[PDB]
Amino acid sequence: GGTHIDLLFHPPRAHLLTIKETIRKMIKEARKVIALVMDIFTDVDIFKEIVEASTRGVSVYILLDESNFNHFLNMTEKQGCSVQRLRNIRVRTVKGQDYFHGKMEQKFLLVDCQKVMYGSYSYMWSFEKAHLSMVQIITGQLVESFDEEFRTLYARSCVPSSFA
Amino acid sequence: GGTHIDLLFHPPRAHLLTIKETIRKMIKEARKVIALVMDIFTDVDIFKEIVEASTRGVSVYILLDESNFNHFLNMTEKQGCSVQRLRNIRVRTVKGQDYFHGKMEQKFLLVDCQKVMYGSYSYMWSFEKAHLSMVQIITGQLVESFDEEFRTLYARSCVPSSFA
Ligand SMILES: Cn1cccc(O)c1=O
């Protein structure tokens, strides 16, 4: 079996769901594992869906760019919903080489080693309302390469400073 | 015929060329058309390669995010190499919905309707030296979808203010 790819856009073009709806649906349908790599994560609806997946028992591994991590922390604080308390969620940070902060410029969502959303959509209010973006929904062989990249990234990630 | 995808990383993992080398090689080998969509374009080596392609006769269409366009203009000025003077290069800008500037969060390189580099690598010094990133090299059927998205984006692009 090979690889299948569909494209989604924001604003939508020739597909019924928005990218955000698609992200929420993928997370709702997760059975076992969610692996998320994200540059900036402030979107509350998407966060809620991930918390809720973790309460059904899904293992959630999140890797965030270190330089923007505080924005996710502020968002969890405001929602009164500390990620440290949630037993099925792990959050670690990734950084690039400094000079000026080097960043992890990577994002993707990998659900049940089965389906990947890969593209330019960051999990922020502004990608729902303001920005033009595109993603791929990937299934098949190429998903195993995203799995391997996730593990590679995870190996180079750090416990965030705040956590103890 | 279907679609073929290879992944490249920065830093490199199990491939001989860096992403920047790959970008320069794709542009050097262009025979007819380069279509580029880019959020920020300040890298001088990559610019030089595109200018040089255009002097061999390759048609170059570039679409840049409007809010960062000034960074590309500054770079061309500094290189004493005005894009308005170069007859085989067209540059237009794209923006999102404002509230706060909505942005075109899209980037990709499409050469000869034949090969696409699609991923998180922006054409800046910092992606060569500092940031972690990944791209896909795509050939086959899916390339026709990037072609169609390029034309769609081009249709919604504006002549930059500076140009007259
Ligand atoms: C991950 N990714 C993929 C394509 C384009 C992007 O700007 C990006 O961040």
Swiss-Prot record, chains A, B:
Probable proto-oncogene that functions in the epidermal growth factor receptor/EGFR signaling pathway. Activates both the EGFR itself and downstream RAS/MAPK and PI3K/AKT/TOR signaling cascades. The gene is FAM83B. Disulfide bonds: none annotated. The chain holds residues 117 to 287 of 1011 of the full protein. Phosphorylated in vitro by CSNK1A1. Coiled coil: none annotated. This is Protein FAM83B. Belongs to the FAM83 family. Interacts with EGFR; positively regulates EGFR inducing its autophosphorylation in absence of stimulation by EGF. Interacts with RAF1; displaces 14-3-3 proteins from RAF1 and activates RAF1 within the RAS/MAPK signaling cascade. Interacts with AKT1, PIK3CA and PIK3R1; activates the PI3K/AKT signaling cascade. Directly interacts (via DUF1669) with casein kinase isoforms CSNK1A1, CSNK1A1L, CSNK1D and CSNK1E. All members of the FAM83 family of proteins share a conserved N-terminal DUF1669 (domain of unknown function 1669) domain of about 300 amino acids. This domain mediates the interaction with casein kinase 1 (CK1) isoforms. Therefore, it has been proposed to rename DUF1669 the polypeptide anchor of CK1 domain. It comes from the Eukaryota. It is found in: Cytoplasm; Membrane. It comes from Homo sapiens.
